Amino acid sequence: MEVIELNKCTSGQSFEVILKPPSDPSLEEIQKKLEAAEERRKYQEAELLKHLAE
Amino acid sequence: MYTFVVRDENSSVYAEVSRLLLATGQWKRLRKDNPRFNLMLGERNRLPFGRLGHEPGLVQLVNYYRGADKLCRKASLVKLIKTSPELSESCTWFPESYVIYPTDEREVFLAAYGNVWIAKSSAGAKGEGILISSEASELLDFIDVHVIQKYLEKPLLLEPGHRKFDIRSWVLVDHLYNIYLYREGVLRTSSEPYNSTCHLTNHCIQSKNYGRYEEGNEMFFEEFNQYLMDALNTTLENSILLQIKHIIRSCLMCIEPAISTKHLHYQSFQLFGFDFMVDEELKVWLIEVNGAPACAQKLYAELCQGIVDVAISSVFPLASIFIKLH
Amino acid sequence: REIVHIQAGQCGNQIGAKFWEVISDEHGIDPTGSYHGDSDLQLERINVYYNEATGNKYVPRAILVDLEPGTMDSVRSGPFGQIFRPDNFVFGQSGAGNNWAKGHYTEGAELVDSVLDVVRKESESCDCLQGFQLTHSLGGGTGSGMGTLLISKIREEYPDRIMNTFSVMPSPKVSDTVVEPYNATLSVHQLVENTDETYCIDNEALYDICFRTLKLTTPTYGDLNHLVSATMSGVTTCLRFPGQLNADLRKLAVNMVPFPRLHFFMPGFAPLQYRALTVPELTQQMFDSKNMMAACDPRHGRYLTVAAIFRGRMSMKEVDEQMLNVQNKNSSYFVEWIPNNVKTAVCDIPPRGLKMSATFIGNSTAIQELFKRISEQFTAMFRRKAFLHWYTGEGMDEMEFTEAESNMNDLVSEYQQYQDAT
Amino acid sequence: MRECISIHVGQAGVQIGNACWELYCLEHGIQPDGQMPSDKTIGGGDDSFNTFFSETGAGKHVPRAVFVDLEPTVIDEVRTGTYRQLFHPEQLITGKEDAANNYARGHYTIGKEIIDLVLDRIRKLADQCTGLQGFLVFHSFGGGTGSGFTSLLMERLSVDYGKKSKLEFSIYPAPQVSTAVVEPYNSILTTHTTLEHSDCAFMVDNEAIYDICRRNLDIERPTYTNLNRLISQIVSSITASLRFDGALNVDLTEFQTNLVPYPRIHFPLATYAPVISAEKAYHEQLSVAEITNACFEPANQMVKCDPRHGKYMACCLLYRGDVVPKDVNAAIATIKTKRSIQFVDWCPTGFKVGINYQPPTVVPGGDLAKVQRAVCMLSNTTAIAEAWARLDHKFDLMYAKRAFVHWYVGEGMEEGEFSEAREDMAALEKDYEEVG
Ligand SMILES: Nc1nc2c(ncn2[C@@H]2O[C@H](COP(=O)(O)OP(=O)(O)OP(=O)(O)O)[C@@H](O)[C@H]2O)c(=O)[nH]1
Ligand SMILES: Nc1ncnc2c1ncn2[C@@H]1O[C@H](COP(=O)(O)OP(=O)(O)CP(=O)(O)O)[C@@H](O)[C@H]1O
Ligand SMILES: Nc1cc(C(F)(F)F)c(-c2cc(N3CCOCC3)nc(N3CCOCC3)c2)cn1
Ligand SMILES: Nc1nc2c(ncn2[C@@H]2O[C@H](COP(=O)(O)OP(=O)(O)O)[C@@H](O)[C@H]2O)c(=O)[nH]1
Ligand SMILES: [Ca+2]
Ligand SMILES: [Ca+2]
Ligand SMILES: [Ca+2]
Ligand SMILES: [Mg+2]
Numbered sequence A: 001m002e003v004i005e006l007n008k009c010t011s012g013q014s015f016e017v018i019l020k021p022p023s024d025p026s027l028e029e030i031q032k033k034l035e036a037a038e039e040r041r042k043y044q045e046a047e048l049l050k051h052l053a054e
Numbered sequence B: 001m002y003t004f005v006v007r008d009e010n011s012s013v014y015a016e017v018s019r020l021l022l023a024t025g026q027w028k029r030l031r032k033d034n035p036r037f038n039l040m041l042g043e044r045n046r047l048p049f050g051r052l053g054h055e056p057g058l059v060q061l062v063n064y065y066r067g068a069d070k071l072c073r074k075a076s077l078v079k080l081i082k083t084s085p086e087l088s089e090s091c092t093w094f095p096e097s098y099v100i101y102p103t104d105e106r107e108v109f110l111a112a113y114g115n116v117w118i119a120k121s122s123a124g125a126k127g128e129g130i131l132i133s134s135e136a137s138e139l140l141d142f143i144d145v146h147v148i149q150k151y152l153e154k155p156l157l158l159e160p161g162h163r164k165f166d167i168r169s170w171v172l173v174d175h176l177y178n179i180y181l182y183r184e185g186v187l188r189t190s191s192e193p194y195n196s197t198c199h200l201t202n203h204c205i206q207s208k209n210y211g212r213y214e215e216g217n218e219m220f221f222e223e224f225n226q227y228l229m230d231a232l233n234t235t236l237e238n239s240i241l242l243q244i245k246h247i248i249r250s251c252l253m254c255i256e257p258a259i260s261t262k263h264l265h266y267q268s269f270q271l272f273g274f275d276f277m278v279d280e281e282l283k284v285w286l287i288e289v290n291g292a293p294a295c296a297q298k299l300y301a302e303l304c305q306g307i308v309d310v311a312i313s314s315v316f317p318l319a320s321i322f323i324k325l326h
Numbered sequence C: 001r002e003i004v005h006i007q008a009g010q011c012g013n014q015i016g017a018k019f020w021e022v023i024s025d026e027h028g029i030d031p032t033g034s035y036h037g038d039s040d041l042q043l044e045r046i047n048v049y050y051n052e053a054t055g056n057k058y059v060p061r062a063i064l065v066d067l068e069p070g071t072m073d074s075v076r077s078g079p080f081g082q083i084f085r086p087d088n089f090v091f092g093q094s095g096a097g098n099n100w101a102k103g104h105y106t107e108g109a110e111l112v113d114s115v116l117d118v119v120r121k122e123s124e125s126c127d128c129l130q131g132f133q134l135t136h137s138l139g140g141g142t143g144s145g146m147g148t149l150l151i152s153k154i155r156e157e158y159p160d161r162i163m164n165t166f167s168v169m170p171s172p173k174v175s176d177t178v179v180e181p182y183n184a185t186l187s188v189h190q191l192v193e194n195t196d197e198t199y200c201i202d203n204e205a206l207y208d209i210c211f212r213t214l215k216l217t218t219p220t221y222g223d224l225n226h227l228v229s230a231t232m233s234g235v236t237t238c239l240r241f242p243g244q245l246n247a248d249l250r251k252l253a254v255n256m257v258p259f260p261r262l263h264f265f266m267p268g269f270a271p272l273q274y275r276a277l278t279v280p281e282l283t284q285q286m287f288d289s290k291n292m293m294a295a296c297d298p299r300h301g302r303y304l305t306v307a308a309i310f311r312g313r314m315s316m317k318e319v320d321e322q323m324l325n326v327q328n329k330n331s332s333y334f335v336e337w338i339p340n341n342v343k344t345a346v347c348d349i350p351p352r353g354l355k356m357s358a359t360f361i362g363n364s365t366a367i368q369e370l371f372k373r374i375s376e377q378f379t380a381m382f383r384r385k386a387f388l389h390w391y392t393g394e395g396m397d398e399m400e401f402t403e404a405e406s407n408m409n410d411l412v413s414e415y416q417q418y419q420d421a422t
Numbered sequence D: 001m002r003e004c005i006s007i008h009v010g011q012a013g014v015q016i017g018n019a020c021w022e023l024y025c026l027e028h029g030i031q032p033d034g035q036m037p038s039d040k041t042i043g044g045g046d047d048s049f050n051t052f053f054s055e056t057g058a059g060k061h062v063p064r065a066v067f068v069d070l071e072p073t074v075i076d077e078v079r080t081g082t083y084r085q086l087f088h089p090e091q092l093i094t095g096k097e098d099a100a101n102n103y104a105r106g107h108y109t110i111g112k113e114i115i116d117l118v119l120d121r122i123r124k125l126a127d128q129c130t131g132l133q134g135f136l137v138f139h140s141f142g143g144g145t146g147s148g149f150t151s152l153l154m155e156r157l158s159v160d161y162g163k164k165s166k167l168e169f170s171i172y173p174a175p176q177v178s179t180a181v182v183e184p185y186n187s188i189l190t191t192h193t194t195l196e197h198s199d200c201a202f203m204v205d206n207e208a209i210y211d212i213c214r215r216n217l218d219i220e221r222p223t224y225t226n227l228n229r230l231i232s233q234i235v236s237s238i239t240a241s242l243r244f245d246g247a248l249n250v251d252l253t254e255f256q257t258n259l260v261p262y263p264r265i266h267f268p269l270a271t272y273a274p275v276i277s278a279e280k281a282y283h284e285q286l287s288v289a290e291i292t293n294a295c296f297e298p299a300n301q302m303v304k305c306d307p308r309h310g311k312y313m314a315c316c317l318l319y320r321g322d323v324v325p326k327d328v329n330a331a332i333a334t335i336k337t338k339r340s341i342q343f344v345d346w347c348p349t350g351f352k353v354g355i356n357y358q359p360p361t362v363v364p365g366g367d368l369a370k371v372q373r374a375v376c377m378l379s380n381t382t383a384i385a386e387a388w389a390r391l392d393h394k395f396d397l398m399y400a401k402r403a404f405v406h407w408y409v410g411e412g413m414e415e416g417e418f419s420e421a422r423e424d425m426a427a428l429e430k431d432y433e434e435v436g
């Protein structure tokens, strides 16, 4: 058991105790995913309106 | 109304428990994967302890202690006894044992190396997978995780027959971590004279002469005590059971901090089968702890009823065959 | 977040009228639309069902539709008849003759545009329209045929809005004409496709409750409608009053409808006397089949989803203990593959004249029994093409009957499919 | 000094943000009108509390926060509440209608239409920063907005602020505390999309908070306010190091450095003690030894699981009040000889300790008692994977029948995203199993 890195100030203190030692997608890509989902929503609505028009 | 689920169709013990539970009219069996249960009779392996105790408004009890495998596997039991300070490498009631892989203890075993030893594993079932030998070379050639344990060359022999035996004790630990030793144990005897089949007392392995001296090579306490009185002028309680109670209590107290459910969101109980050897000096040795024991046929009724009384109805009350070890 | 309410035909306008009497009384609105209530909770979400007109008057966002004047002259003479916006009465003179085809294809089609004119006018003064609710029967002509024609045209003009119905299913025990199973089978096909939630009110169930439980020797439609407005007030409590809930129509449908076609709900109510009802009695009764308003036995099916709404001041610890007790006594009747599929909701405002009440909403596969019995009555006549001339005389072909029958039998099959799922 | 922007998303994110900033103002002597008499530098400064609060020339101290919700009723309570004068109107952002507990609707449908406005409002906060550390993001796993919009926002924040650290405070669903049927779907979908964009995430299980409120505060039926004031004490303990003079966890980077050896396994377990009822007629103050022992009680963990059956990768003790290092070491020694504390063998068996001398602040007229000392333990243990397995099992039950899936596909999501997110959680479960 060892105490290291003891730092003190007026607000408190901090230290480390050791017991034993050891043995991204781009903007265009996100935009495309959003637009792809919008397009599928647009397709489904058009199928609905086509069914309703029949 | 109380609800339970069954997830080990091969448990003879909890098959009788669930049968009793149903015959009280106040317990209802659900399908295996209905989570809205009070009581789980869990599977032997991969029990999903992490899904217990999160159903709102349900008190949930299970019939296994998470972490009790450390006691109920051979290699891990050896490690537990060696590295637990409360059991210590100085432990007097457990045969000298080393863990050997096909951390490993092959070198320290050779250093120690009557030099007869026995090699086993928990993968060993039905008798095979076991080798008793006097040369360490034959033992290691047979292994290539196993345990190598000092073979007790001087066992207490029942007369007539000049025959080896082992003692099975049943121990119930409830949710309060009370330790209950079933007052009825069983001796599982060899039908063959001991010659240094007559070395392995397992009920399946037992050979002609099977059932000669006792029904199915099983002797119960009343007779064994009576034999100890006639032959040795002593009693089962004095010469053996005091040691058995001490060993049971030591083992179970040792792991209690690691497995206790007293402040957990679900609760556990478990039935253990302890296996002991007696040497010719009436010293008792622990051989193995079994986390999913079967029972002796005559004892199935009494003990299964006792489980419901002590472990189940204590948590789920409706509308002593045990010795409490403390 | 506004709801536009529509009521169509005789049944739909009579039940609708009672609905607005009840909830106007709960929100403190008098028959003249003046608010004279005592709690700000009454007004906090008043905008869901009411528009504010100058003079702090509240006008129901309600549209009243019929193909004949009679029932809507009755509404106008009724107790709260003055509360409705005069422009929101849309009626023809011909009638629909208990004939789905007249409601859907001939007489109704001449009237539907001007109804859609009032709907558009209401929707366009909405800050953010939640969706629409329609009350109708399925056994007559206007609410059934013209009502489902309305839904179709609303869905086309507002394809992204939720559509709900309180639909009265016919029963021979409480029947006006023999063609009701035809009218109801044609409507159920529409509802399967064009509603998000349909509360199934079986007139058989309503009658038996008045006769057996309320001990009414000779129930009238008024007695039946008393049970219905009470249940309607209950299921919309979470929309009308400030709860910790925060649910719009779409959230309700998402949580209650696991498969798009299985959106037909058994509603229920308790109690059905000055005696204080305890929480156990409330919970036991609301799950009792005898308190269900669709004549289906839940023990013959499984619950996919359940909402249980308690109203009044009571112990919630007690509510939860009895809910969890009821589930254990019905463990077999909830599907295991939708975890935590029973919702408990509380509202501290009790209905008129009750200290506490409970509304039940169940998506049960037992509802298939309701459709099965309607299918059987349909087929008994349709095998002999009996009474079909009333429909072919309005230009319908037999094939459209075969399709609607086929579609309903499909619906029944899907319910049995999920009732046996493990 | 280096600034931190807090982002609260959805109802749970907003209401918890309310509770946290109420507490922050109490801890720093900031009145609800934004004034702060102790701050003798008017109009600016680079004190430690300035990492969370900016300053106007009139001396108002303004949270570096944005609140975002897809419907306006929750944030409207902020706009008219006790702390209305604290926030700039641009910081409170509301849409017209919510995501109806549907991740796909919050992520694709409504998210697409509001994300640029949110980013624009965050950019305005960032332009006030001399050296922005990154973001603290508060949301539910279960809500449509909290799951769906947060994951979209996290992706775009990675793009627009590539260098900056992102920390999450995530509310994990519990049926004890009003849940939607589909919250397992939303949880898995948002964890899979957010995993690579989050450096360190603190899960709070509503079940644990609910139980602590029942058992320790004797509240029979906890409200959101009860839950949120308790949660805000734990959040304050975790963020105190960024807002006060100190030497442990001084910047957001240090949370990853100290708690997360492997990027994916970035979910530390929080344990807090003591929680004492304010209406306790008679109470007795707990010692350093006792509150440190309590940190290894599952009943005090933010996520219900069993650390005795996992392994530790890191462990921080954060003390507030009357604590000296000598007491901490004596307490640790005692505990290590009595508790099942197993570290993975490729990590030091140690504790990083921080002590702040100011005892916890409590809301006047609240449920929590003033205590002389308290501690929050942050430990990265494999045991927290229990909560993933629980959630994954409920997902599996519904998804095998495709229950409710049509709602998500109906918003433009593909069924394939379900199984992709589910196979990522399976991998994550295997990761915990490998290290543990
Ligand atoms: N602890 C806590 N949990 C909350 C709070 N509000 C909601 N929740 C939980 O959050 C989950 C629901 O998500 P919400 O945050 O309410 O939903 P949202 O993000 O607004 O999403 P939508 O309303 O669907 O648009 C449920 O599991 C609730 O139990 C809160 O104030 N405190
Ligand atoms: N150290 C030792 N000395 C002497 N005999 C031993 C021994 N270890 C085991 N045996 C004998 O071998 C038999 C089986 O040993 P062990 O208990 O390891 O196998 P097992 O696990 O299959 C029986 P159980 O049904 O209790 O699990 C014992 O009954 C005992 O007779
Ligand atoms: N008519 C009603 C009324 C309700 C309720 F809100 F409960 F009152 C519900 C309802 C059912 C349910 N269920 C049904 C069964 O599965 C659990 C959720 N949830 C909710 N929530 C979930 C998220 O918060 C907003 C409202 C509401 C549905 N229809
Ligand atoms: N519960 C209830 N059912 C009604 C009422 N009026 C009619 N019905 C039922 O509704 C069906 C008749 O439809 P109705 O609404 O009168 O015809 P419509 O005007 O053409 O829509 C039959 O099933 C009747 O039993 C009513 O006021 N209450
Ligand atoms: Ca005409
Ligand atoms: Ca300053
Ligand atoms: Ca990053
Ligand atoms: Mg064995």
Ligand SMILES: [Mg+2]
Pocket: C010, C011, C140, C176
């Ligand atoms: Mg009529």
Ligand SMILES: [Mg+2]
Pocket: C246, D010, D011, D071, D098, D143, D145
């Ligand atoms: Mg919301």
